[PDB]
Subunit: 727 residues, 4 copies
């Protein structure tokens, strides 16, 4: 019609902009100049809209898209309206089956680059040269919930990366914890069914806080290690950018000389590790179920590209049996204290998709999609995975041609004798559809293995034993890893774990299941067990109190790399601050606050009791981002309150409650001049308290003190103080 505003305000700028500054938009409109090979190769399917006639799928233009065709303007709809029928028909068939697991996820385009050639240890083309850039598509996710469940639930997160190499797609389909729950793939449906919503009533969505999960866990002690990790703050990450990623399984690197090295893949978050606290995460699933998704998208639109360092734990073939645990057991981790992570490369995510359904929804990642230079191992969990991803995608994606769906296509050439199938796009001209053939001179042809561009040959591992359905006795050890994890945690981390098991176990209706988990915890650590028992009104028996603790892991009593916070890796860029306005802000405070934040790449959100504008003491007009209720403290990392007419919000329940929720969830809080009248709301001494920045104005050290607090993430020392506080 010509419905946009004449000021062109309906359209976000094609330049990096801070979160909330502009309406968010499709990747290619938001950042047209951010390219990569894969992004360029999708131009054949991108479709514009501006200046084009509205049409049917057959290209016939539509005159009236507001009405069905009827016999009289008040008459019956006619079957002949083919415009209405194609339109409703496409609408009626929009949905596809969501992923069996990892239905909820958020994705983005990016690129990867190795620091140096790894040719000595792997002939994988994407790792052979530091100037070799490989496009990537990454999808982060939760395990249990459907596609419409919440982001900040407690859960293990999925971390899958599609590498569009020159010698094939390589998918690294990992999680954000270094182990999995089960050992053998045959039990996946059992474990997954136990964690998913119970079969009679489909409750609860996106949560393990229910009977079947803990029932399973309590009868399968192999699960404890990963359960420890999910029960910790690892299970509620601050963002997909602030968690670690792992392949979990031991795989093989094969070099040109044919030598196999055992490898465990890792991703290190260059923004560091940071997690929410439980009450915040649970509230955030309600106030904004799309928090991670939104944050990922906005970090990319703001230029805060999520960056990760690919790392490798490398173990020589000769050291296979040198640990107390089996290298092929997925419920066991390789302590970095024993086997360090070697820095391999950097992955940068710098552009959102155009259409979520087309790119994110249909992305198909598979762990068996490896390339020459990599190989598998006999890890029994991995072994079954190679069966499952290929299988599930014939029904999710409607057929065997899911590789022709734009996001999934190789950027490298692909030729073979495979034909037909639903949705076939490629029109093969080869006179032959079989080999060996003479009619096309046998093309395309097999290709011998070699140092570069050769065919895929599996490493000749010796295989020996009888056909058996048997767990390896080396896998029958379930408690030392959980114990190692436990002892590597800070005290406040240990308390949060205790609190996760406690909350969780309290949602289990059948008491005996709770007791059974407590007994299992007593096999790991008595202090953990007791603390959780106590929260559940359970007493340990004299026998539980004497269970002998599991042995150290290869002599290790703790590995600080297992903690989120024991070793400071804080990084403020991309974090966000809430600024609580009033109707006459000391503009001097605001300029100081704002400039200091921007200097460190920390965003702000101007908040108030209504939308619109307020005018500072000097006449500066301040645009309001959202209300105290509309953009709660759960969505920010810190809260700053500038002086002015504090009496304007001093008695505002929402303004006060904002501070209480923020204080409760250990976020740094800064009160300027009269804003200190809010000290009484959170019971802050006259003298002060670590974690609360206060001054007569937002000058001098005020923002630096506040920014040092943001660097340590949360004010852990405040925990005991929050114990009470009614919020």
């Amino acid at each position: 019609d010509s419905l946009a505003p004449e000021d062109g305000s309906h359209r976000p700028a094609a330049e990096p902009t801070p979160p909330g500054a502009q309406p968010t938009a499709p990747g290619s409109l938001k950042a047209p100049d951010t390219r990569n090979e894969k992004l360029n190769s999708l131009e054949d399917v991108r479709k514009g809209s501006e200046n084009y006639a509205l049409t049917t799928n057959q290209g016939v233009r539509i005159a009236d898209d507001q009405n069905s065709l009827r016999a009289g303007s008040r008459g019956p709809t006619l079957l002949e309206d083919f415009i209405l029928r194609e339109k409703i028909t496409h609408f009626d068939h929009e949905r596809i089956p969501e992923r069996i697991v990892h239905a909820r996820g958020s994705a983005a385009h990016g690129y990867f680059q190795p620091y140096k050639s790894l040719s000595d240890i792997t002939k994988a083309d994407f790792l052979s040269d530091p100037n070799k850039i490989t496009p990537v598509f990454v999808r982060f996710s939760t395990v249990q919930g459907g596609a419409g469940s919440a982001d900040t639930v407690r859960a293990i997160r999925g971390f899958a990366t599609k590498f569009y190499t020159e010698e094939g797609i390589f998918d690294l389909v990992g999680n954000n914890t270094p182990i999995f729950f089960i050992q053998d793939a045959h039990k996946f449906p059992d474990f997954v069914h136990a964690v998913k919503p119970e079969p009679h009533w489909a409750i609860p969505q996106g949560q393990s806080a229910h009977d079947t999960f803990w029932d399973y866990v309590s009868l399968q002690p192999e699960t404890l290690h990963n359960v420890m990790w999910a029960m910790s703050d690892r299970g509620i990450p601050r963002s997909y950018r602030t968690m670690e990623g792992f392949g979990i399984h031991t795989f093989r690197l094969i070099n040109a000389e044919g030598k196999a090295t055992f490898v465990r893949f890792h991703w290190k978050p260059l923004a560091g590790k940071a997690s929410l606290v439980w009450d915040e995460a649970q509230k955030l699933t309600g106030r904004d179920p799309d928090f991670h998704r939104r944050e990922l998208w906005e970090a990319i639109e703001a230029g805060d590209f999520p960056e990760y360092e690919l790392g490798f734990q490398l173990i020589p073939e000769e050291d296979e049996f040198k640990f107390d645990f089996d290298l092929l057991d997925p419920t066991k981790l390789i302590p970095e204290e024993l086997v360090p992570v070697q820095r391999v490369g950097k992955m940068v995510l710098n552009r959102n998709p155009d259409n979520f359904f087309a790119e994110n929804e249909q992305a198909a990642f598979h762990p068996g999609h490896i390339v020459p230079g990599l190989d598998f191992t006999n890890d029994p969990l991995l072994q079954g995975r190679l069966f499952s991803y290929t299988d599930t995608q014939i029904s999710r994606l409607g057929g065997p041609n899911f590789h022709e769906i734009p996001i999934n296509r190789p950027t490298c050439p692909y030729h073979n004798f495979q034909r037909d199938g639903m949705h076939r796009m490629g029109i093969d001209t080869n006179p032959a559809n079989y080999e060996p053939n003479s009619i096309n001179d046998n093309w395309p042809r097999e290709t011998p293995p070699g140092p570069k561009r050769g065919g895929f040959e599996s490493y000749q591992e010796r295989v020996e034993g009888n056909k058996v359905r048997e767990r390896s006795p080396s896998f029958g050890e379930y408690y030392s890893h959980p114990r190692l994890f436990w002892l590597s945690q800070t005290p406040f981390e240990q308390r949060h774990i205790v609190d996760g098991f406690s909350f969780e176990l309290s949602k289990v209706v059948r008491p005996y299941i709770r007791e059974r988990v407590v007994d299992q915890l007593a096999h790991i650590d008595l202090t953990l067990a007791q603390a959780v028992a106590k929260n559940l009104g359970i007493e340990l028996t004299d026998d539980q109190l004497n269970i002998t603790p599991p042995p150290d892991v290869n002599g290790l009593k703790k590995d600080p790399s297992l903690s989120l916070y024991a070793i400071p890796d804080g990084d403020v860029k991309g974090r966000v601050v809430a600024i609580l306005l009033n109707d006459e802000v000391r503009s001097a405070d605001l300029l100081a606050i704002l400039k200091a934040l921007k200097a460190k790449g920390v965003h702000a959100k101007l908040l108030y009791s209504r939308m619109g504008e307020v005018t500072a003491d000097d006449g500066t007009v301040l645009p309001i981002a959202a209300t105290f209720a509309g953009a709660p403290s759960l969505t920010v990392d810190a809260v700053i309150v500038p002086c002015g007419n504090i009496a304007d919000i001093a008695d505002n329940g929402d303004a006060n409650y904002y501070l209480m929720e923020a204080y409760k969830h250990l976020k740094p809080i800064a009160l300027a001049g009269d804003a200190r009248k809010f000290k009484a709301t959170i019971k802050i001494a006259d003298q002060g308290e670590e974690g609360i920045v206060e001054a007569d104005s937002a000058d001098g050290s005020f923002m630096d003190e506040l920014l040092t607090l943001m660097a340590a993430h949360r004010v852990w020392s405040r925990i005991p103080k929050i114990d009470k506080i009614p919020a």
Copy 2:
């Protein structure tokens, strides 16, 4: 490698060659320079093969494509063989559901052009200028059989044209007879179930000759008009090049002024009309089930392009009710004597597909795919068709995005708010997915209907009546068109129809059904009825002999345009002759023979009792294409026997049968010199017989006779003599 022959004889020349002279090939390899807009736009999806590596669909080069991965070379196959599984999965999912009806069909690419601008009568853009060339994709088919059934069955044939216009796809989905079997789409499942394979045991394939087909016919006399056509030689075409096409229904043309004109669409074969004879057709279903498909492919490879003229029967809106049948009645034809066909354009089929599955199996035609300039009518069968083709495509082609399947894609722009669906290819960047929207300035936008490039608007036909499930009383007349068709046939076409009914009803097991059908014939024509009753050994009753024939149609007692043969229109270009060889052929007969065939564009096939070669009297080495049994007379249009050493083949029972068969099927036979010894095998008098060319040698006179006869197609005066030929 190098498996191909060093001589390069595995590869067909990329130049037009006669049927059987080269191996057939994918169209773009056979005629890389035959181009059209649609063909060039499929180049984004065409895939080569020569000089490429064999890879997985993920682009991973395969080293060994001869073996699965196993533990030991006599060991068990390993689940980690992702290369085997990908290849077997794709293979396992190759098939899609064939079309419910018209499953068996053959298709080629071509182009269309009008003879002149038709803007006085229609604003359809493809009809607006003689220089507007429109790419087409045509699919010819049978109705009843599966995708695997025979081409030369007795059946109605489909003739479907997809026009890729600049204002959208228009699909003209017609058949080879001017009417359909039934009146209301509600009975289509009933009719179709009656003719398809009976349900208990799924017999018979591709045949109407069974109990349920004739039970339905006998109880639903609206079907008799299409049945008369099916039982004539119209039901057994020589080729898809030599049959007519019809849209069947009355549609509308809409001009720039908005005046509506009633039109019935027609395809006139420029090769002319020709059909087989029942016994030849039926025997051809066993010797070459792919006969028509082959014939179409090879006509195109030889440069014998199937050409059809598009014709319109135009009726003014005011003459809606001037006939004695209802224009909306699909079981009624508009006699060309009443309303002549206006020659409007020509379609040329000039290129085979590259991959049958990709382009022919997945093509989706729909009668409802119309463009501004055309509209529907209330024809109750067409109204139901508008619903079905859209609906069936969702399962056949797996989703609502079948228009993104390359062969189906419009070549003109297409933009709307439709999103998702299984296998979405298009990646929409539009910020909006709804209209009206302000966020993308309401684009894509509606376009008012107009003279050119306008949006679609239905002709504003007045609708008046009550909501009723009721047949219009004007449709209740079932014998006059059938009779009109019967009186318009030559005496031998009449005879073939009688034999078509007799043979078919002879296969109906319940004798009461045959009697009921015969009662129906008595209402059409008593001569027809008795001749059919006589072969079933049924006696017409007194009452049935007095049934008063139906009235003429608008005073017509016959219309020659309804006969295949009444008016000479045959063309020899593209036909084929079998040349029966001997071990010492008179090389001067071959020379005169081949020179004249070549002058008319008639093809030849050199047959012998073994493959290899034979040497003429002169020393010319003559390559043999096939043996006598290998390329039966059924596959050729005429048989010529050159002189030489006739003793070599004069006792060959296959050679004798070759002539007995040709003879029985009314085919021209020419005997040179001593070849005249074969006359005793087909009991031809010493003085000769019309239909048989004989002479001392194969000079110019003899070949001119053979070519005159061939242009008359078959030797209809021979019918009476074949009775006494055991063949």
Copy 3:
């Protein structure tokens, strides 16, 4: 209505009758006293029709099944004609993808019984006792052609038997020749693409007589053994009743003591071995493309039950 004839000649006698004497019928109307455990458990899904009202699939009775709902009897069909849309919808979605290979086939119900207990060599319950009868379902087929292809082509024939045993279904999926064309499963798509219709034009239907098949055969000498059989009269059986059947592979028999015995499975036609001649066979693809399916259906209807040892 009074649509059936008064003399009742539209209904086939529900007793054994020779080929062509009556119209053929669904097994349970033709032979209602024949039964087995598998036929009895299908009873819950079998649907009749005599004396019932014609309805939609939601159970609504239909008054007029001859017409669409329109605005005037010469008017446009309305979108609210839900009876027409359900019927056309069902019609529209009747087909499912044919079998990748062995799409052309004919089956029948029956029963199996061991001569004596084989518990010394196998603990398989269906062979544990001579009184133990196992209901079977058997589908015979060709390999190459589609579901609408001809029966008497030159082909290897499939012989699949589904054993509804008391300790699970056992499917014995074999062919009428003792070997297969190829050695490793990895080459299956290769071989099958070569035998199937060439990809450019989708010719020829149900025939190995074309270039790609022979190209393959010539480059893969391991195929020669099954080609030899296919080129013989084994490739054109007179009927499914006169062909042998083999499981092809070596499988194992496992007894209660845990002992393994190698085993090759065989089916012997109690009607003896018999085949057509090539010319007859190919002409029969033309005159009656459903000859084997019809012959099997009629043998059973006549009481000439196909028997296999």
Copy 4:
């Protein structure tokens, strides 16, 4: 048809009618119902046209649409009264 994979969604247990349902529709993906009727079309003589149509009537009658009068031109238009 896509959500429930075919036209036999009425045979999925929760969706089935508890009253009689008999017609001539056959096949489709996941067909449960094994039809024994010799005929799969009507009118048919071989099953004496069963199952049969049933006239509209007060109870147990076939569906017949109310005969509403329809008068207007074929238009894509919003009634002015909905404005």
